[PDB]
């Protein structure tokens, strides 16, 4: 086509979606990771994660307001990945990289799994 | 912080949100623009438009599944702006610029109003 494109649009959209999350505006699901609870927007979770895409495209699961993750999932790892979904920034540290990578494999977030693998390889 | 950032994340999120819109997945509102109907995600509309942000933060309107726009709004202008919200690309043409600018003023989409004003000024 002959469209023009606003370079910062996608980043500005994501920033506003994170502001809605902050302010608990139109959040429509609670993700439970053992004793912790995280509120989010199903559409953002599906856009970032192959696991959430599969969950919320299922004709029964699409209607659930609570999703319980596998008990082996680390809440801090999940929190770091949820923040990445809404900001593009990943708080990857020596002390959390193993939990983050395991969580990203479970959630099916291939670019995160890729940077974790590279950071681990560099320390070996 | 000491975060790393994935450059393409925001663009990839927006592309996936447009794929959900295409496939009518988790759309939760119908915008009516006279005889036409447009299905969308409230969160994407709020992230892009000051008018939708005000509508869906209202304690009564947040619960509506149908929103009727002012009868003066042009459906083609709205369609072009809805596509821009989900893609960052604006199909601005000599034949639609006046309707697009009027619609963007109503929807409170300041960057669009800005490029329309500039394109109009250049032709004068």
């Amino acid at each position: 086509d002959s469209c023009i494109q606003f370079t910062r649009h996608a980043s500005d959209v994501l920033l506003n979606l994170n502001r809605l999350r902050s302010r608990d505006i139109l959040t429509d699901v609670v993700i439970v990771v053992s004793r912790e609870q995280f509120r989010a927007h199903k559409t953002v979770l599906m856009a970032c994660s192959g696991l959430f895409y599969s969950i919320f495209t299922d004709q029964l699961k699409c209607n659930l307001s609570v999703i319980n993750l596998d008990p082996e999932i680390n809440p801090e790892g999940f929190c770091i990945l949820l923040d990445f979904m809404y900001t593009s920034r990943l708080n990857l540290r020596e002390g959390n990289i193993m939990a983050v990578m395991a969580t990203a494999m479970y959630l099916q977030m291939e670019h995160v799994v890729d940077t974790c693998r590279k950071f681990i390889k560099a320390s070996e | 912080d000491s975060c790393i950032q994935f450059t393409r994340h925001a663009s990839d999120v927006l592309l996936n949100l447009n794929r959900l819109r295409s496939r009518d997945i988790l759309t939760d509102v119908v915008i009516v623009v006279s005889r036409e109907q447009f299905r969308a995600h409230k969160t994407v509309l709020m992230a892009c438009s000051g008018l939708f942000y005000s509508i869906f933060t209202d304690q009564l309107k947040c619960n509506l599944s149908v929103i009727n726009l002012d009868p003066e709004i042009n459906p083609e202008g709205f369609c072009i702006l809805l596509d821009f919200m989900y893609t960052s690309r604006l199909n601005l043409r000599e034949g639609n610029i006046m309707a697009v600018m009027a619609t963007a003023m109503y929807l409170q989409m300041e960057h669009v109003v800005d490029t329309c004003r500039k394109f109009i000024k250049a032709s004068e």
Binding site: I4, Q5, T7 | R89, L90
Partner: peptide, 4 residues
Amino acid sequence: WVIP
């Protein structure tokens, strides 16, 4: 704004 740019030409994509």
